[PDB]
Amino acid sequence: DSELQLVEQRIRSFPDFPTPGVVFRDISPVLKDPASFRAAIGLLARHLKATHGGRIDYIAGLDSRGFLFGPSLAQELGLGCVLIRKRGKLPGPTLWASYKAELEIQKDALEPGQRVVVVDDLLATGGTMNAACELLGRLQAEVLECVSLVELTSLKGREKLAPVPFFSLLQYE
Amino acid sequence: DSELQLVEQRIRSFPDFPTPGVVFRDISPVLKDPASFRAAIGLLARHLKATHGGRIDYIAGLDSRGFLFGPSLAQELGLGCVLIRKRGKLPGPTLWASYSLEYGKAELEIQKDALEPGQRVVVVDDLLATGGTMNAACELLGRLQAEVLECVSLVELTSLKGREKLAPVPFFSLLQYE
Numbered sequence: 001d002s003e004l005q006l007v008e009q010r011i012r013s014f015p016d017f018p019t020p021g022v023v024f025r026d027i028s029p030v031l032k033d034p035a036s037f038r039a040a041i042g043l044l045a046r047h048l049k050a051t052h053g054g055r056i057d058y059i060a061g062l063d064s065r066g067f068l069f070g071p072s073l074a075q076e077l078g079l080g081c082v083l084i085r086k087r088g089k090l091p092g093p094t095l096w097a098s099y100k101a102e103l104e105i106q107k108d109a110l111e112p113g114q115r116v117v118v119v120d121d122l123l124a125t126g127g128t129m130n131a132a133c134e135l136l137g138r139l140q141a142e143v144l145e146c147v148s149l150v151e152l153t154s155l156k157g158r159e160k161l162a163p164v165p166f167f168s169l170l171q172y173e
Numbered sequence: 174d175s176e177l178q179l180v181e182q183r184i185r186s187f188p189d190f191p192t193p194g195v196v197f198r199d200i201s202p203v204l205k206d207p208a209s210f211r212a213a214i215g216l217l218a219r220h221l222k223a224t225h226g227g228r229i230d231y232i233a234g235l236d237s238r239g240f241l242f243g244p245s246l247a248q249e250l251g252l253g254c255v256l257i258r259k260r261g262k263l264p265g266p267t268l269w270a271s272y273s274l275e276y277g278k279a280e281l282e283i284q285k286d287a288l289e290p291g292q293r294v295v296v297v298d299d300l301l302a303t304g305g306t307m308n309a310a311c312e313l314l315g316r317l318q319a320e321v322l323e324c325v326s327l328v329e330l331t332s333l334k335g336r337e338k339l340a341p342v343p344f345f346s347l348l349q350y351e
């Protein structure tokens with residue numbers, strides 16, 4: 001896929017960051033190349049439309065690198081974007097979950113029965129995405145799918161999310 | 174201006190957050206309403222094109238709420254977006270800059286290879302308050318020898334005089350509150 005190649009060629013891999021033995025996948029060059037960013041959003045949007053049709057109500061973007069993709073993805077789908085933040089950042093009534101770190105969402109971000117797709121840049125252990133799904137569930141929202149640009153498959157994050165479906169553009173061990 | 178109204182009607186105000194006496198301006202509803210978000214990006218892009226023509230090389234988005242607007246604004250302009258992050262998150266060689274946030278200090282960081290000398294950038298964040306954050310971003314970019322053409326935000330809290338702090342770098346906001 002020519003479009004997928006535009007994204008893959010702009011992932012930069014750094015060995016031994018942040019700790020020896022691990023390879024950090026840097027998505028920054030995807031943002032810097034407008035063709036690459038457009039390809040990434042287009043591919044995610046096509047997948048989501050082909051899988052869910054008109055069932056999606058909102059995209060939920062994860063702080064902070066999810067915020068880079070969520071709004072553009074939402075716009076491509078004609079949808080709004082709701083935000084899941086690091087705790088202590090949102091005003092008003094909120095719910096929070098720890099996984100340590102803590103995520104937060106405004107209680108009025110979604111109404112019961114609304115259907116959401118969660119986006120982040122990269123799925124590793126799945127801890128972060130799992131916490132987001134739990135938060136959303138507490139608003140009685142339905143999480144249709146979680147998606148990312150990158151998935152680190154040896155960390156088995158996909159299994160952590162099950163039975164919520166997961167999709168990534170690119171996979172690395 | 175109906176487009177500007179679409180943005181203004183989706184700013185939510187929270188008194189006494191995070192401390193008593195202030196009013197937090199929440200742009201979250203702008204993101205939730207796709208027409209509002211589209212209006213915000215369009216208004217920013219129109220201003221930037223009218224002010225800089227074709228001279229902008231890159232948008233720099235500020236972690237974390239600037240990330241919400243940077244890529245869409247960049248895309249509207251046909252440009253890439255570079256990232257200025259909270260310190261500790263970026264691989265490769267970096268530069269960082271501290272500034273006062275609340276009662277203590279915070280640090281922003283950029284990859285030393287984010288920009289080449291002479292490249293021209295516009296910085297975007299959701300809201301300008303004291304101007305500490307945006308000032309730090311401009312310092313980092315200046316240390317890469319980039320030229321900051323302008324800083325922009327959706328909201329500006331004018332009593333805090335962030336515009337003066339940024340001078341002589343130009344600043345533009347869609348909406349102003351005391």
Ligand SMILES: O=c1[nH]cnc2c1ncn2[C@@H]1O[C@H](COP(=O)(O)O)[C@@H](O)[C@H]1O
Pocket residue numbers: 023024025026027062064065120121122123124125126127128129157
């Ligand atoms: O290799 C990496 N590259 C970039 N971000 C990463 C990497 N590993 C973890 N992350 C960040 O940490 C998060 C996922 O961690 P998880 O909770 O272990 O799945 C995502 O939000 C990423 O932004």
Ligand SMILES: O=c1[nH]cnc2c1ncn2[C@@H]1O[C@H](COP(=O)(O)O)[C@@H](O)[C@H]1O
Pocket residue numbers: 196197198199200235236237238298299300301302303304305306307335
């Ligand atoms: O009232 C507010 N609403 C939303 N964000 C704010 C507000 N005040 C400060 N901030 C955040 O802190 C920043 C700038 O504060 P400054 O450094 O004093 O200009 C931006 O990154 C904002 O996202």
